[PDB]
Each structure stands twice: as structure tokens, then as C-alpha cells.
Symmetry: C2
Subunit: 325 residues, 2 copies
């Protein structure tokens, strides 16, 4: 029985846009090919000098300007990212540096594109257990700096952004209704970026440190995993799909989301995305989709939302939440 | 707000190659005597050229499993505290799942530097007490030798490689977690860092070369003023005195630093478990190693009250009062 609720949101995307017309001019592709395979038209790119922590701070500033309460109260900062400024100090510690909160834990977490829903799962457990009260769950990514822009199959997908969600103790009405998780470690060679190691199964990695994906195998894994766990979520919470107001999967690819929406029985018109003008922002994709929906009037207080973050690992966390703002 | 979690099993693995003080004498201008005096370390373990953090972690879960009476097939969460993961986003935790093939588990890497172990247990306690999980593996693993500058005598003598795992599960009888304290000093970020995508910090270009960098004096100063008062606050939160606590297990960064903390917090060094002498500074792993050294030696017994205090790069920390459930 959850004692946690999501009560504020903020997002920031860097100003520089990367259009398909800009991409036709550096790789051999076309606007029509891109929009047809992926659904994206633009992405935001961080400046040469602005990094993930800079984006996370902006995202929290946006939340700060839009939240009727105070953030001096925050007692945990969770930052889900893959493009941290430094190996350490962590990005969460950079956020604390800037706002100066006096008594908070700070932690970077890594589940790649599932990082946001992993972070919200963590906040739900930390609050519900009575260990925390105000927790900042932040996703921020600088995918442009680890993207192979010599590769037509991948450089058209990725953008930069950050988004922040505030979670609080709510003892009246639960804000988290159910959770599903799973990990398919066997898929680690299907979606990766090199680090200290440069081989997986004794097989040398490609990409020269940049992100690498087997798009079809990722697509196939999402398509065969999300529908059943979608159903399992609704069962765990005692809910029908008719009770579900919005479906917010990880915005990796509009066709993938369309496909998922057919294999699951769920309509695309009840599905929030952010892929068209921000590309695939990894752990930030879901926050962007939510804030676009908040700004557009589609997402309203007390609605039932299903966030399904999945990514590299392969791993995922699916969440049924009740909008609390 | 009573805890429903207890640490129930442990396993460790430290790499094979030993890096003695004598070895370091032929690498940089240092002496065995200056090292044992300034840091208390004699040996470190070094991973092989082709073994990495995920290898170490898997070896640590192997050790735990060969020592746990129950099964690990129903582990529902893997948390790996690491700063030196094999790959950027392929999660070390997911490499651990791939090896053992557990069927329904979350996998997540966490980064709080040398504080990652205590942060990972704090997470596990909240994840289990809230009823979202039943059995969690909290793993720390580091391959610091791969990110160490072996032309800097002030830093390359400090670090080693190791991995250690703790199992946390539901215990509705008696809590295994009694109190927690946390804190973050983001402005101390330039005191202990390693370059990632960025190579400047508030204006000034980073040093090293993607290798770990530490201001040992300032790290000493922080924590010497931080840990004693939070030590006491942990006891107050749990309703205990210094005499109720059996073992103190701080981050094994430096024996002089540990002795000094024990000096200005009122707590005796003979009641503190360390692992610096033969394993060096293994970052997030140092506490698990001190724990596993104490159980093998018969010093850490079940139901004993023990305080873990992980502090590290951030600067950030998590301190925990726990009851040994093994």
C-alpha cells in the first residue's frame, strides 16, 4: 500500500535543434526515410559546454518555478543518466551543489532508458517505508556526445534533455498502484556503449565508444515483453485497460510504440510520446512525454498513468501511477 | 516506521595479483615505511588484464551462494555500486543476471563512489520494508587499478580491486536496520573526482588523465568533521548509546583517517573493522571486505549491532545502524 505520490514536474531541453534537414546533410539519409521509420522530426542538442548536470539543474529550476511548495525539504536526489559529467562526483551531487539543500542523499543510477521508472520505483519504496519524505527523481541525458554521427542507423534517433519529478509522502491516497520489473541480461550485446571494457563475449565491440544498437532485436524484445507485462501491471493493481487514462512508454521509436500499441490491446490515442520533436532521450523520454501532455491539458490530476521504461541491459520497470498534480 | 529487512548472507572475491609496497617501490618514488605510516596499507589486489568489475561481482555472488543456506533463484533486485563498470550503460547488474539467469529481477547500477555500498543497503531496506521486494542482492565491485595513475605516488599506492555481495531479505520478526543518516556536500566535488564526459569543474581544467584524482588532506578534513557528529546522530535516532554498538565499520580508506575518526568520535579502534592493510582502498567494496574479514575471523557474530559509514566522492555519505542477521 503506497504512501508516495508524484506532485511536481519540470523539463528542460537545450535550445539547438537538429532537424532531419540537418541530418540529410551529414549522413546519407532523408527526412522521409527518418519520419517513416522512427516518427521524429527534430532533436535538441546540448551546447559544446553544457553537460547532463547543467540540463538536470535547468529541469529542477523549471520544476521549482512550477511547484507551489518548497524544495529545501528534499531528502534524496535520484539522477538516472548514462552521460554523467564525471565518473564522479555524481550528477546528483552536482544538483545538490547548485540548490544547496542542507540534508539530502544524492545518488546516480544506471538502468539506461529504464532509469526514470527505476528511479520512481526507488522513490516509492523509500517514501512508503517511511525513510524519506521529499525525493527528486531526475533524468537527464547528453546523448549527442556519445552518438556515432557516422552511422545512419543510430545518429538520427538520439537527443538531449533533462526532466525532473518530485515525489512526496501522501498518506491519504496512493500515487503508485503497481509495479513490474524484469531483466534479460542475455540481450546485453543488443544495446550497449563501451566503457572500461571493449568486448562482450570475447567479441570486440564496435562503435568506438559510441552508442551501439541492434534496432531490430531491440524492437523485437520490446514487442514481445511490453504487452504481457502491460497486462500483468493492470492485473496487479486490480484495474482494466478502460481505467487507464494514458500509456507513456519509453519514446524510442514511434513505429515501435505503434507496434506495441497493437500487440497490447491499447489505443494510440491514449498514448503520450515525446519522440517527434525531441527524438529518443533515453531515461528522459518519459518525462518529456509527460510534460508535453501537462502543458497541452491532456494530463490532469488523479488520472491513471502507465509508465513503461525499458532499455539496455536489457531491463525494465513498469509503473501504474495516479497523477497527483 | 519499523524496518522489515535483514542482511542474511555475505560473499567476497578479491583479485589474484598482489601489489605489495615493495612492488610500488620499483614503480614510483615511495617507501614501504612511508606507506604503512601515512595509510596503513601493505598489499592491494589487482584484477587481471581481461577481468573486470562484472567478473569480480560474479565471483562475489559465487562466494555468497556457496555460503548461503537458501536459494538465490528468487532474488528480485540486483543493485551494483560501482564506479568502474565494464561498459557505460550495459549495467554491471545486468551482467550479473545474465550469468546466473535469475528469471524475475530488477537490475540497477548505482554511483555514490565509496558510499555506494551503504546507499545500496539503504535502498534495499526501503525496497523491502515497503513490501515491493522480498530478496535483494547488494553488490559492490571496483576495478580501481584500471583507473589509477601509476605515475602519481600520492594516489597510486592507495587503491585496490575487489568485490563483495550482501543479501537482504524480509524479516518481519526483528529489524536488521535500526537507523540511517545521510548527507551531501556538493561543493566538495573537486576534492575527489574522475573525468567522464567533462574535463573541467567550475571553470578549471581537471588533472590526471581520466584517472582518479584525490586531495587526500581535504578528504581527511571532511569526514573528520562529518562522521563523528553523524555517528552520534545515528545512535540517537536508534535510541542507543556507544556501549550498545559492537562493531564500527567505516569506509576503509586510510588507517590513520580511521584512527583519527575513532579519536574524535568517542569510539575505540579495537571495536572497528577495517580492510586497508591487505586490500587497500577498494572504494565501495571496502566495507564489505572489512565485514567479511570479521566473519571469517570469528569477530562478527549474528545479532551483533554494527555501524557502517560509507562516505566518498560527492561528497556524499550514508551511515547505517544494522543488526547482523547472519
Amino acid at each position: 500500500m503506497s504512501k508516495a505520490k508524484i506532485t511536481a514536474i519540470g523539463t528542460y531541453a537545450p535550445s539547438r535543434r537538429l532537424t532531419n534537414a540537418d541530418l540529410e546533410k551529414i549522413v546519407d539519409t532523408s527526412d522521409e526515410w527518418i519520419v517513416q521509420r522512427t516518427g521524429m522530426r527534430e532533436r535538441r542538442i546540448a551546447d559544446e559546454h553544457q553537460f547532463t548536470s547543467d540540463l538536470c539543474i535547468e529541469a529542477v529550476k523549471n520544476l521549482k518555478s512550477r511547484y507551489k511548495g518548497t524544495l529545501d525539504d528534499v531528502d534524496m536526489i535520484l539522477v538516472a543518466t548514462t552521460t554523467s559529467d564525471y565518473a564522479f562526483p555524481s550528477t546528483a551531487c552536482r544538483v545538490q551543489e547548485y540548490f544547496g539543500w542542507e540534508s539530502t542523499g544524492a545518488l546516480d543510477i544506471n538502468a539506461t532508458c529504464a532509469g526514470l521508472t527505476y528511479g520512481l520505483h526507488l522513490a516509492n519504496g523509500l517514501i512508503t517505508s517511511g525513510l524519506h519524505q521529499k525525493i527528486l527523481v531526475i533524468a537527464g541525458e547528453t546523448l549527442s556526445k556519445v552518438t556515432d554521427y557516422t552511422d545512419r542507423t543510430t545518429c538520427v534517433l538520439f537527443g538531449d534533455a533533462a526532466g525532473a519529478l518530485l515525489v512526496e509522502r501522501d498518506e491519504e491516497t496512493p500515487g503508485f498502484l503497481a509495479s513490474v520489473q524484469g531483466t534479460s541480461g542475455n540481450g546485453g550485446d543488443i544495446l550497449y556503449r563501451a566503457g572500461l571494457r571493449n568486448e562482450i563475449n570475447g567479441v570486440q565491440l564496435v562503435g568506438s565508444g559510441k552508442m551501439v544498437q541492434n534496432g531490430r532485436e531491440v524492437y523485437k524484445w520490446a514487442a514481445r515483453t511490453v504487452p504481457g507485462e502491460f497486462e500483468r501491471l493492470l492485473h496487479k493493481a486490480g484495474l482494466s485497460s478502460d481505467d487507464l487514462d494514458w500509456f507513456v512508454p519509453h519514446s524510442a521509436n514511434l513505429r515501435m510504440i505503434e507496434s506495441i500499441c497493437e500487440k497490447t490491446p491499447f489505443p494510440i490515442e491514449k498514448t503520450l510520446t515525446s519522440v517527434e520533436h525531441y527524438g529518443n532521450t533515453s531515461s528522459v523520454s518519459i518525462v518529456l512525454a509527460l510534460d508535453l501532455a501537462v502543458k497541452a491539458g491532456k494530463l490532469k490530476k488523479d488520472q491513471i498513468v502507465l509508465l513503461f521504461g525499458f532499455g539496455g541491459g536489457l531491463t525494465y520497470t513498469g509503473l501504474l501511477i495516479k497523477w497527483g498534480m
